[PDB]
């Protein structure tokens, strides 16, 4: 639809330019060959000067509205040259720039006077409720996860990544230690296993 509306606006403007050649603008005719075959040179000038003035007006209005319309195809072609660099030749972190979801890759296809981009994205499906906690107190020390969240299936405590449920055992090689236990609002007693 966005490509067809450009062809429709560029054709209404050229049909208005042809149709305005059949207006007389105050003269005795719209045909220039009938003014010239009916009037002597002094009288003819006053009639051809009305056609010249009115037809110069029609060309001037066409050209002005083509300059405004060409300035927004240039804005739209600069956006498409940015999406070719950042969505096709790279992987983008800007939200909703290349599609809907988390961007993986894009594929460029050619259309008439245009371009079509096929955005491949990642969408997260069915979810589940869990219980969570900001930190875990073990030996008078708080432990925070290195990359993930602390979840609980009801009895045990795991650590998982944020975009896929894949729970694991809380060891000292996926957490880190800082500070005391009385400073974190919501800390939870559990054990931190030691792999060595």
Partner 1 sequence: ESNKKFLPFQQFGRDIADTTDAVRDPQTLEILDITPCSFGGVSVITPGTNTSNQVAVLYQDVNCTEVPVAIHADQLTPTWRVYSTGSNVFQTRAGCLIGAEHVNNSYECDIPIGAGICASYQTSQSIIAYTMSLGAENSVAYSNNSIAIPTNFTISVTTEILPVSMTKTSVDCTMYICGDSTECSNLLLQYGSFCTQLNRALTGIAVEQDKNTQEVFAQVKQIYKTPPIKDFG
Partner 2 sequence: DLICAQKFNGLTVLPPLLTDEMIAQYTSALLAGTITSGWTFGAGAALQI
Partner 3 sequence: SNLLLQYGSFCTQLNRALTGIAVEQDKNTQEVFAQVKQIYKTPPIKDFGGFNFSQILPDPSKPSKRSFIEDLLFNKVTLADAGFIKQYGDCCAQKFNGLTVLPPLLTDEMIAQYTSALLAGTITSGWTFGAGAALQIPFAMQMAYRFNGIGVTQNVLYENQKLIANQFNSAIGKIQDSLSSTASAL
Ligand X SMILES: *[C@@H]1O[C@H](CO)[C@@H](O[C@@H]2O[C@H](CO)[C@@H](O)[C@H](O)[C@H]2NC(C)=O)[C@H](O)[C@H]1NC(C)=O
Ligand Y SMILES: *[C@@H]1O[C@H](CO)[C@@H](O)[C@H](O)[C@H]1NC(C)=O
Angle subtended by helix axes 4-19 and 41-83, to nearest 10: 170
Residues between 95 and 134 that touch a copy of itself (CB under 8 A)? 95-97
Residue 119 · residue 99 · CB < 8 Å: yes
Q: Which residue, judged by CB position, is nearest to ligand Y in the bound state?
A: 129
Q: Which of 155, 164, 186, 196 binds ligand X (CB under 6 A)?
A: 155
Yes or no: say if 116 and 130 are a contact pair by the CB < 8 Å rule: no
Return the residue matching tokens 């054709």: 11
State yes or no: residue 153 binds ligand X (CB under 6 A).
yes
Other C-beta atoms closer than 10 Å to the C-beta of 164 total: 7
Are the C-beta atoms of 160 and 145 separated by less than 8 Å?
no
Find the shortest distance in angstroms from Cβ 126 to ligand Y. 7
Q: How far is the CB of 148 from partner 1 (least distance, A)?
A: 10
The yes or no reply on residue 194 touching a copy of itself (CB under 8 A) is no
By beta-carbon proximity to ligand Y, the closer residue of 60 and 189 is 189
- 68 scored as a contact of a copy of itself (CB under 8 A): yes
The 10 Å CB-count burial string (b at 16+, else e) for 65-78 is eeeeeeeeeeeeee
State which of residues 2, 8, 18, 94 lies at the interface with a copy of itself (CB under 8 A): 94
C-beta separation of 83 from 117 below 8 A: yes
Label the pairing between strands 136-137 and 168-169: unpaired
Q: Which residues bind partner 2 (CB under 8 A)?
A: 14, 17-18, 21, 84-85, 88-91, 105, 107-110, 112
Q: Which residues bind a copy of itself (CB under 8 A)?
A: 60-61, 64-65, 67-68, 71-72, 74-75, 85-86, 89-90, 92-97
């Amino acid at each position: 639809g966005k490509l067809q509306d450009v062809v429709n606006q560029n054709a209404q403007a050229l049909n208005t330019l042809v149709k305005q050649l059949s207006s007389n603008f105050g003269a005795i005719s719209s045909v220039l060959n009938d003014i010239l075959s009916r009037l002597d040179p002094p009288e003819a000038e006053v009639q051809i000067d009305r056609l010249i003035t009115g037809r110069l007006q029609s060309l001037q209005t066409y050209v002005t509205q083509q300059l405004i319309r060409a300035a927004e195809i240039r804005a739209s072609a600069n956006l498409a040259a940015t999406k070719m660099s950042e969505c096709v030749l790279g992987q983008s972190k800007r939200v909703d720039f290349c599609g809907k979801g988390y961007h993986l890759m894009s594929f460029p296809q050619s259309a008439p006077h245009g371009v079509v981009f096929l955005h491949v994205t990642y969408v997260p499906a069915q979810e589940k409720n869990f219980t969570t906690a900001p930190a875990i107190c073990h030996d008078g020390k708080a432990h925070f996860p290195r990359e993930g969240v602390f979840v609980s299936n009801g009895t045990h405590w795991f650590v998982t990544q944020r975009n896929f449920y894949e729970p694991q055992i809380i060891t000292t090689d996926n957490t880190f230690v800082s500070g005391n236990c009385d400073v974190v609002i919501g800390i939870v007693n559990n054990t931190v296993y030691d792999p060595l």
